[PDB]
Amino acid sequence: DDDIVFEDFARQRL
Amino acid sequence: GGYVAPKAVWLPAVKAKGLEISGTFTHRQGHIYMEMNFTNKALQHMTDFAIQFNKNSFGVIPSTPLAIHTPLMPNQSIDVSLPLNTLGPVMKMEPLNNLQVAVKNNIDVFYFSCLIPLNVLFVEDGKMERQVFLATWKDIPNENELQFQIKECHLNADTVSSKLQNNNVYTIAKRNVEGQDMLYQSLKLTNGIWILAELRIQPGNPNYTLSLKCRAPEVSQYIYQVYDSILKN
Fold it and tell me: Which sequence positions carry the modification called Phosphotyrosine (chain B)?
């Protein structure tokens, strides 16, 4: 769920 | 325990016939205050004090009559506290955060200017529900993202979140990727606007990349400014 997207979406903007 | 700017000389005696004014705004439990200190450097006495605020960009207005019941004496210096709210009238001011102000007394009227530090406009319920931060983040088009460089700041992942916290910038998430920590954070203006931020902190690198996403981005340059001030002070 939510946790994941933040890593998802951090990683991406790195 | 928020961040408060030292008192700055808003209206120096030399301009208001002996009346001198030191100033600073404060946010406490989401209630705004203009912290002044009056000084009669003159040789008359001063009764009949009122302060009036011009229209500004966040509807900012005094919420009481000025709190000053005695004449002000040759040489007496006193602290005032002016409660403010933002249900007042509005005009796009430039700079966005400028307050044109009329103070009056028995002697005359003195117009002067002071800048509202925006930080004291950060409400307390500015922490985005987590779903809500993500959806919003991708929503607001990257066209709409400004980036700032927190020149020389060195304070930790952990110290950063906590200062911004007192000043109502709330950390939603802190992730690390290739060694760099990235604080995901949200704040919100008294007038309702969200600012969303990603602070990115490097191993070594003396700067701190700040990225703001915001429905009205003219605000962002100011959020920078006062994230800065916080992180320095």
Answer: 33, 224
